[model samples]
Target: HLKTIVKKHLSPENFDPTNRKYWVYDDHLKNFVNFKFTGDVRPWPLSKINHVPSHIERPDYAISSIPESELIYKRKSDIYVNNEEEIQRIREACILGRKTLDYAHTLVSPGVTTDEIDRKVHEFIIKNNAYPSTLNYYKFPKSCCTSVNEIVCHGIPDYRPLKSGDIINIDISVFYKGVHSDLNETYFVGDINDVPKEGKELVETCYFSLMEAIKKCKPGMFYKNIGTLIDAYVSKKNFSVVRSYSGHGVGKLFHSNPTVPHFKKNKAVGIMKPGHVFTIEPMINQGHYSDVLWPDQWTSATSDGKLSAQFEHTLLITNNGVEILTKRTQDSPPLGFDTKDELYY
Candidate 1:
């Protein structure tokens, strides 16, 4: 019935309110009027004119739709201690995954469509005899996830070519040899001069925050402390860490337990244990971390239509240190480097 209501009153076609009771079609005529079965009437934003909302890039109805999945991946069950030979195999996949991500992310530039980049990535994966993990999982199409400016995460690749001043996050996950690796990074397209200095400051701060968070991963450490430091750094920059989504335990299984929050005062569980592997990706936004999903049920946008950025890498927990298995080297960057410079070359 909710879907039916959306199809009827929310669509661009057949949205007729004439000769109808308690029904409004035009977005501008909805003031959020409160109408209940109790026979009470009052002003509601639902009945206002031009009422689609001017907050985030997406709408309000979609914000409340963001909820957790019913079936959580039993990641603990899939974890295994690999011998020397098997560990080598796992490292090989991690290497190849980073290469794939490197090649795909290089295509991030002005005038390039995310769909076009996806096409290239899809072809490259198939050519290498591997498959894109996100191609069909949960009915997700495309080889990677592309989140652009004002898009918090999961923005679908479309015909929208990147603009000169745009910031985009390319999330790449791959399945090869019965294992999965996850990683992503936001890039500054074209010239940095086109964007505000504040955007640059916030982005660079996010990169450092991510680095600090990753460096803190070691045995006997509290996972909650990760978010604590993250929230502190973001607050120093006057930014906000997104709470709508978080990093996860990744490996043979795509997602697992131990919800990793990126904000302060979070009581998330899971201490750093040997043989434990996960990601510490934080999604921070210049606006609100509260995001809304699009109709595709994948792309999540910020509530205030501001810039969003993220950096992610998979790792292995060690007794006293951590191994950055998914570190971007020889290709990714050495911090604050312009991708469009390399892309243009």
Candidate 2:
């Protein structure tokens, strides 16, 4: 019964007995899905990475050809929260990141290639006198991530032309004055006002789930409990949280521990400190929570080939309350949320 509906969507790549090592035919998706990160996918073109001017301050991996193991943060305490002096720099970096993102927003529309988006983002970051955080960090080619439809996150920019009625997520992070600020938002192409009934609900679930989780942040709360409220909120809307990917500490490093899960009762360790800074980006799925990784080792897709939507905001836990450093500006895309019709959808 499951395979019948998916059969219509099946492609030629779904079969190959010899390729069983990493790829498997997913009956629900009707495609050959790679579940592990084996580094077998042909690498994308990455010639323009790390071209900062001599005056620009850069991260450890800025121009290095290989990843530096020493720069990796292993412990939760290893992550750095913003100090009084650091906060000034962090706020500036986030403001620049948001500015770059706003410009990127103008470039998104039907028929534009994701690779073009990456080029413009790289250009915009450099034009603003900052460095893109994702470039060459463990060999990521693009300056920004362009996750389309089924791809969950870290979707590398490519020549693929975005089509009408399709949704795309652009994840942008920038390093300014040695501090990093990250944020991303999903935008719908063509008549977003007419997003299919299911599409609108999926976006609503992903958007509000992060908000519910953000409201729980305070000095006394445990980091593990961030997902508790998120899970409950999304569940009420009949959506599932992607357990494989969670939010994390994101001030000085691209990825760090004190893992921020989007599901209930995770074993993440740490208590929210006034100075602690991190992100609350929840990846909510329209179908099951299960996910599959592409051969690129970065792109994550849904097991059921369903659409996933995500919203991210880097936050600071202040003495009085939480501060959303990457808060959307007036120019940011409008989230057409209407609670009256959403409850029954």
Candidate 3:
């Protein structure tokens, strides 16, 4: 009935939405100045986003939502492996991941946009002949995950510029040769000394929690025991650990099983075995452990609207203990964890 009314006055051609000639694409600078259909969120123009070299290998889901490989959502029952060859590839990929995160660290300032950082990361990965593990996995667009301030995780890099007092997490994952490496760290935007009192504390606590938890990983250790340390540490500081998202197995695929929960009383399966590789990232929140999702569905924020911080490392359980695959270099800039003399708790 509504269509019949439009046919009475305007030509039916006007309703042919597919006809590009009849409809003009405008920057909306002049005409339609009052167009008010959307929200305040502005997405980055894909055309303006940078591209990787044609010769460089990229994930199947890189350019579009379509999967280039048949490995979509594939789970592995053989969670642990003793293959020396595969472990070496994992180590190599992780080393590249660390370097990428360290280099991306140089780009984090007050004025630089996250999209720009992502572009730099994208190019760097391709230059090294590795594909960004996050690029197309689960349809994520960017080459890296940039979570700023209150954003919990999986934040899509956009045109938004970083500002002082902002805490941004640069999560990098790379598919090198035949394996994948995953790791990330939250960094203060400006002078570490000038970060807001609470912001500094949150980020630092999150870092410490990860460190203490990492020390607990080793062969024969129960996977569920890791959270006991993380949860106990964060709780003592009056902060909460994000329960909605936890760390997971990483190696052949971006995400695998033996779920790593960051909270207490979690039923996480599996035990730490020699040659087992997985991530132990704790997303510590300043408020409640619950989170709220942005309209984009990827960006997660605290339910109480407070800041959250996270630190992650892809670990390999070895003969005697675990190896931090993403350990910072000796020359890598300090994260201010050493400057503070007092214990995190």
Candidate 4:
């Protein structure tokens, strides 16, 4: 049933490509039919993605209007769906996203603006015959999402330049073959230890927190339990989870349902299934985890205005374990911890 609907939407007729194109990660939980698009294709209904210019083709799967989401997202989203063919396609997208992020991060250094980071990603996507998912979505200006320093996530790339100890997260989502993929990881401006211990700790905790969660997420495990274990490890490190945003079901839509929150005690939906696809992004804060949004509505900052860090990857739940589609490459720089107290172990 869900396959029929997906194939239908995948067709050229139902596929609307006004400013952006989308792929579908259809979640089939019995009668529950959920569709996760990369994200809001338009600011409102037909509002165009970036203020730069509209695209030539209309996407079929974009949300006609941005739905004010209310329900807490569950990890059993489309991103975790375990279909071989879909996984293959998602892997391709993940590779591109990872490589694009790698290129963007390689450009990271002292005095580079987050907006420049956006340019690098944008150019790479177009050059590769791919489209940046976040560009123009909700009227975003840049081709990527750049979160710097205290910015918890979704930091809008702008004139803000990197300092000696600044860090940033370059989030990339791409649309190819009418499918979309998402992933992001943080980068430091200079030496890791040169920063505050809290910053170092936040970065390391964010990296391994997802690792700890992935350790316990196996078949038959409750989706909510993933966060339960993740938060426990984070709490032990004295860090907090950013509750404002979460990992989501990714395939076609920019953000899908079955939301994956990093915080504890979430009443998320579903248990682990071999075919599930989702993300386990852990955003850890050196101070409080609460976030404040900048006027742009895309940039989010830590409430205490201290350092924060996060790592994300689209995940595929397997028969016995999970696979991180966005695993780092040999060329990818290693995640650094400033101090021995920097991680949860």
Q: Report RMSD (Å) for each prediction in the order shown.
A: 11.3, 8.5, 8.5, 13.6
Candidate 2, residues 81-110, lDDT tens digits: the string is 679888878788889988888888789888
Best by lDDT: 3
In angstroms, the error of model 2 at 283 is 0.5
Candidate 2 vs 4: which has more TM-score: 2
Query: Each model's C-alpha lDDT?
Result: 0.66, 0.73, 0.76, 0.66
What's the TM-score of each model vs. the native?
A: 0.74, 0.81, 0.82, 0.76
- Per residue, candidate 3 scores C-alpha lDDT tens digits across 95-185 of 9999999999889998787888999998898889998888756666678999887788987886567777788899999988777899999
Per-residue CA lDDT of model 4 for 1-345, tens digit only, reads: 756754554332353334222323322111112222221211111111343224523234324424233123544443345467877877888888888888887888887766666776777777777778776566555677777777777766655556767777788888765557788888778766566767776777788787767767777887778678878888998888888887777765556656777888998777778767677788888878787665445667776777788888787777878777777777776667432322222
What's model 2's TM-score?
A: 0.81
Worst 10 residues of 2 by lDDT: 38-47
lDDT of 3: 0.76
- Against the true structure, candidate 4 has what lDDT? 0.66
Cα misplacement distance, residue 64 of candidate 4 (Å): 6.9
lDDT for 197 (candidate 3): 84
lDDT of 1 by residue, 11-87 (tens): 33343433233344323223223322111111111211111223212211122432123143445334344445545
- Model 4: ten consecutive residues of lowest lDDT: 39-48
Pitting candidate 1 against candidate 4, the one with the higher TM-score is: 4
